[PDB]
Design a protein around this ligand. Sequence first.
Ligand code: AMP
Length: 529
Amino acid sequence: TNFIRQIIDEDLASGKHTTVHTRFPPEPNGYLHIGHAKSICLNFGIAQDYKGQCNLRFDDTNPVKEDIEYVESIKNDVEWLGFHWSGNVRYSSDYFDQLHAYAIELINKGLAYVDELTPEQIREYRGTLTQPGKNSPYRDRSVEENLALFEKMRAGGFEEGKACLRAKIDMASPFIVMRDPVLYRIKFAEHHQTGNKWCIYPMYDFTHCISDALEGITHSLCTLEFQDNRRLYDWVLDNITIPVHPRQYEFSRLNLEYTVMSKRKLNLLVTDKHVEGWDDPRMPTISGLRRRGYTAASIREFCKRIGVTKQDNTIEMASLESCIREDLNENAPRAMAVIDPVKLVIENYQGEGEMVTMPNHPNKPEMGSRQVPFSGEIWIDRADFREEANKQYKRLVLGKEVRLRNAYVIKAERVEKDAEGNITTIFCTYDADTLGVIHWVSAAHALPVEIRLYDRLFSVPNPGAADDFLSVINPESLVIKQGFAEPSLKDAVAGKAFQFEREGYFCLDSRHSTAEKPVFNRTVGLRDT
RNA sequence: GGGGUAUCGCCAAGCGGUAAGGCACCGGAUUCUGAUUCCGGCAUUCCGAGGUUCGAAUCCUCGUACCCCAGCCA
Ligand SMILES: Nc1ncnc2c1ncn2[C@@H]1O[C@H](COP(=O)(O)O)[C@@H](O)[C@H]1O
């Protein structure tokens, strides 16, 4: 439970409401991101818990920043997280003729006027946080003139910025938002839904409360910066003929450590090509987290864990990662792949290679097993051989024996070095009856797999508070390796997370993989203690 | 000037009757993955100071810190 649900239980109990109707209203100017997923879980989760409804409304009031590419991706990510909206997809532009009719009501009541103060001047007249504002010389025009001027606006007779419609409230209110907030501005820009029917567009504050009213939203939930704005929400609805009055409630937004959530900044990363695009596995977008190998059930668990409060907060990645780890430890079929490979040849090996049965899940027999090829020339990962090492080290030192995963206890006998003191092969004996572990891949039957080792995109915990967050990108955000994997990984479907034993959970990247050359993204690494 | 918020390293419950829970961290058991599982350890004290009470993180002062607002953006 959280404060919002306690409000909703009060409301039901008092008979204030009989059904709850919430809504998620993303503006289509970018891809959704883990912050948004907190709002999706909240809004759609309350709806299904209370057997209520939840609407998806595209808050498309600003044409010059929005594009149709984002409306289809947003529907796509909302469904992928596992949620569905009530009825049809709604759009603020559905209400464009309705909002205009309401603007005329406000004009006819003398509670709104066409102002002609330039964009610079309205700021000059607005006052400051300590000094009250002052009235526009245009504030007292006749209802009759305001109607005449607003239709001249609607019919594009005024240039952009040369006129706007404003609410007539109080230029000395301590709420800066109530100092005659603009209701309409002129934008000669094609809107991705209404084409060029309109060249006056409504501002967010006017649109938002009338839309919620029209859809019968019982509780508009949004983030803490809209607390002052609630005053204009209630003022608009108290001054127009509307039969209902939704209440707005605010919870704090999500801040994840080591990433930037503003869509203006994410957009710059994509635009200036510092990431592949919105769904790059380093992006904190929902589609990026999907390509990285996250599961919609892991993000719903994240939502569950981070709480819903009024407290400002920054969650450590350790929480996000904890969630995906728990999911994938349960559900990921195990496999073997070597990321940095050095050859290990068993000289004692008699034969052309056998087959060992490997479990698909070490603690869950139910997930079955597979036959993996064993051989004399295997591949091992570099860090698993040390020529000299102290007792803590339980991998292959040149003096002792290690078990190969699900195969033989081998015993280190002789290294062969590359001229630059590097080593090139290790020579070992194997005990024929032996069934400190290391993973391995039969060189003979190995599949070449590209591996993308992903790391946090930024090197500072709060890259947003930096004078230029771009200069604080982590250059090792992605390091591409070429390794080898057991041939069963030939049947990996994109978006099925494997646990590469003693490395991390990895998933195929449909965007780069092909046949013969797969590309595996590392979702997350194992808890290296 | 106005609107908000203070409980563990990060998050969070608590609604006058004696500080939950999760992540991270530190042990120690068990493991053919330095993983997983188990077991245990994690806030005499709740931003500070003062007052009410039998009893205060909860109530009442009076401070202090931080967040948010001056887009014709949302
Ligand atoms: N970081 C965030 N954490 C939680 N909710 C958010 C966050 N960013 C945006 N939202 C919510 O997402 C919805 C649409 O936001 P927007 O994408 O700015 O139009 C609103 O409910 C916002 O309050």
